Symmetry: C2
Subunit: 320 residues, 2 copies
């Protein structure tokens, strides 16, 4: 019996519960029997014997769970084997450290702890006898972490160049097509739900840079946030797309970790290049020494998409 | 001490030895100590204590190895834990079955046994307590098998459409660019070493179809070779590329497994679509239920590239 605690029950955490319910037969015939023994949101929790669909109904119906006990108490006291840490940031680091220090596996979708304390957390997991999985932190459903770390393990990954923010990719693709000012394309992005009222985390390249730090570290390049040169998309105009088009280029926000660079910024990309992908998409080009160049593309976010990444990590920990 | 036998010592097998030598420090600090205890080509072998560089020097210098004992004897009698089966087909099925029946892991690059006896071999591996790895059978260095089978494990992969033959991709890209008859572009392909004197295995779509069968089966679609509708590229002319270009399309040999189809044939692909990739490349688009659409592209063949795939499988069996 695999015992799972879910901490964080906004969009992602609820996504994980939906998927665990929907794919229960397939999950169980792959990793064996499982039960979610605790769920916690930002101010309440449910533990003991309860059903996931109960927890889910209650959260949707009331905006909270059943008990007053906070996420930290569930992390330090509940009976579980693996913690799914999908906490709503806007604490996370402490939930991870405390589950790892209890000798529990951790699957997370939070970038913050990994950006602030990457080697400190990987080592803590190693010192205890457990794993810290983080596929959902970068690329959403797109394999990136397991690809860099498991598939390409005995290769020297020399560089990664990619697109790690769907919202900026959408804004730039849309600006390319419509040729309308940034202010207007942003309002569309907001109407569609891609960008919040304060779209800064996306448009100033912060999200992409956080992800770039996680990737840099995953491939063996020690890096902190302050090491990344970050430039957003707010000064890209339709006129920029026009002058670039005339010479065969589109414009994309590209995150790169190489020997020469560690940056997130707009860049000219030839129309038929793999990184010229449009819409709310992610992409990554890995340049290696023995496997050549390896390219991946997919959805970089979404409820079911993020939930999928979390599940791929749970499978990796327990498949046999 | 992990004991490896290598069977098949043409281009691929020699590639595996080169990589095992070149990446020895990194491999050992990832999976522990290893020694190759036997190597066999199509008519000779070397076993006991010998060095890999000895085996390699001898093969290059003389065209063969040291002992008269054939691959089958090394498979049924040599002391090894994992068999790397890279045999030069133009026997393989028997080397796999006999290593699995001895309770040995098997990593292969041969398509034939998997196409003829997929479920029979997976079950034999399961009945004994071992693994049959086959990343190198399709996509070369490009993750395809571990992607379909490990990353996308708890997803329902609804379809795979890809490009699984670099030579046809090259011939079509080259024909698109130069606009010269098939006979001429094939001669270039031959001069470059991409196609043999008899290029049929490539140009008639046989290679791509074998690979399509492996993939279909990997994703849960029971399929035999006779189930695939196979059409090659020998009747694609420059004029076809011209009429397609006028409407935004290029032409590619696409392998597809879906609910509606199981085929390999030429197909119109929009210029800016991910499967419009040019050169000797591979590519695959996985359409799933929970992770959206996932795309991968890379080198589909080569000595170091195939060797890499084999190593990624060895890592998967023994990383901890």
């Amino acid at each position: 019996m695999i015992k799972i605690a879910i901490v964080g029950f906004g969009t992602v955490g609820q996504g994980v519960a939906e998927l665990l319910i929907r794919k229960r037969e397939e999950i169980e015939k792959a990793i064996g029997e499982f039960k979610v023994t605790a769920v916690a949101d930002s101010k309440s929790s449910i533990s003991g014997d309860f059903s996931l669909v109960e927890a889910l109904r209650m959260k949707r119906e009331t905006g909270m769970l059943r008990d007053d006990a906070k996420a930290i108490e569930v992390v330090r006291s509940a009976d579980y084997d693996v913690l799914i840490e999908a906490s709503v940031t806007r604490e996370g680091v402490n939930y991870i450290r405390e589950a790892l220090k209890r000798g529990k596996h951790v699957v997370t979708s939070n970038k913050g702890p990994l950006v602030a304390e990457f080697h400190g957390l990987m080592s803590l997991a190693e010192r205890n006898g457990v794993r810290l999985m983080y596929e959902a932190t970068v690329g959403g459903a797109m394999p990136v972490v397991k690809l860099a770390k498991r598939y390409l393990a005995l290769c020297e990954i020399e560089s990664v160049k990619g697109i790690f923010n769907g919202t900026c990719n959408y804004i730039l693709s849309r600006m390319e097509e419509e040729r309308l000012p940034y202010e207007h394309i942003l309002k569309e992005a907001q109407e569609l739900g891609y960008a919040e009222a304060d779209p800064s985390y996306d448009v100033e390249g912060i999200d992409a840079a956080l992800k770039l730090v996680i990737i840099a570290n995953t491939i063996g390049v020690k890096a902190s946030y302050e090491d990344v040169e970050v430039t957003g998309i707010t000064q890209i105009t339709p006129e920029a797309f026009q002058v670039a088009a005339e010479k065969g280029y589109t414009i994309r926000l590209i995150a790169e970790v190489s020997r020469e660079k560690l940056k997130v910024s707009p860049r000219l990309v030839p129309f038929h290049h793999p990184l010229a992908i449009k819409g709310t998409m992610n992409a990554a080009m890995f340049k290696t020494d023995t496997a050549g160049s390896i390219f991946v593309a997919g959805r970089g976010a979404g409820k079911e998409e993020t939930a999928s990444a979390i599940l791929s990590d749970l499978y990796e920990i327990y498949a046999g």
